[PDB]
């Protein structure tokens, strides 16, 4: 936890392949774990992002959950901080409501003096004109909850949740998200008990950058214990 004291730069790299459409997203910003604040900008290196931003907000930001503000009595329960120095691997399976599935693999680690997230995404079983492929999703992300539970057999932490995505027509799409973690380092995992992380997301565009801005301000707080 001593590493996160103060302000920490954050760098994110994602390389997704959605039904043959390959997109690379590079993101930079800062995070204050003490206040549980995360200010990032994920610019898509490619000309355009073939999927709505909110779909990949979970893949990009929630991969970095080590900046979450864990209460004092819950400080020991932060598996991400405990395993951060050597990094960790995070595999997400995301089932949309009858609109295919994302599979993503991410590696989180310190390089030099900056956090780095190397992410590879692949979406399959997608239907054209759908909620995701149709771009009907509005550009906004709602506050959500992520449930976290240990697993000694895999020596890793598992997460479950449902994400609500708004749509232009007014429909709300429920996407199931399942997360599996593997500690890269051989040091003690310090895995916690059941606990839920509440996330608040506000999205914005910068005026200066002509390219996609994807400016994101997040506040994540752990609770349940």
């Amino acid at each position, epitope marked *: 936890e001593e590493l996160f004291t103060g302000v920490v730069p954050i760098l994110v790299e994602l390389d997704g392949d959605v039904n043959g459409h390959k997109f690379s997203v590079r993101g930079e910003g800062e995070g204050d774990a003490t206040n549980g604040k995360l200010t990032l900008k994920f610019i898509c290196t490619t000309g355009k992002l073939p999927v709505p931003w909110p779909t990949l907000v979970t893949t990009l930001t929630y991969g970095v959950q080590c900046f979450s503000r864990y209460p004092d009595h819950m400080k020991r329960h932060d598996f991400f901080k405990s395993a951060m120095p050597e990094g960790y691997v995070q595999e997400r399976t995301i089932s949309f409501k009858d609109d295919g599935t994302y599979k993503t693999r991410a590696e989180v680690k310190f390089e030099g003096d900056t956090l780095v997230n190397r992410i590879e995404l692949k979406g399959i079983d997608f239907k054209e004109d759908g909620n995701i492929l149709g771009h009907k999703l509005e550009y906004n992300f*709602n506050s959500h909850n992520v449930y976290i539970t240990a697993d000694k057999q895999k020596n890793g932490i598992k997460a479950n949740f449902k994400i609500r995505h*708004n*749509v232009e*027509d*007014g*429909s709300v799409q*429920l996407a199931d998200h399942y997360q599996q973690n593997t500690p890269i380092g051989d040091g003690p995992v310090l895995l916690p008990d059941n606990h839920y992380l509440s996330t*608040q*997301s506000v999205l914005s565009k910068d005026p200066n950058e002509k390219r996609d801005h994807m400016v994101l301000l997040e506040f994540v707080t752990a609770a349940g214990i």
Partner: nanobody
Amino acid sequence: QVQLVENGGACVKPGGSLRLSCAASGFPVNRYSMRWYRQAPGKEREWVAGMSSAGDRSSYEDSVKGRFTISRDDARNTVYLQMNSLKPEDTAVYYCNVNVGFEYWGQGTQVMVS
């Protein structure tokens, strides 16, 4: 800054009708879409109705399809939701959501058919 107040939640027998209302202060209703979420006691929150910012298109779910009549009023700065004939499946409470910025949850009103 931005706040929501709901009203119209009253006990109604099966086959009756009530007019749920959601007023908002801190933003113009026409510029932002509004959604209604249904939460049964102890169950996961779900979505029942949604009205876009323009207001010319509205969306419902299969369970309540053909029963609700979502409307908006800019002069009153309030959205309204009808129920047509109530059924026991509508025993859950209703919450009013509007994502003008960050994420806002209305206080909500209770609706049980009983």
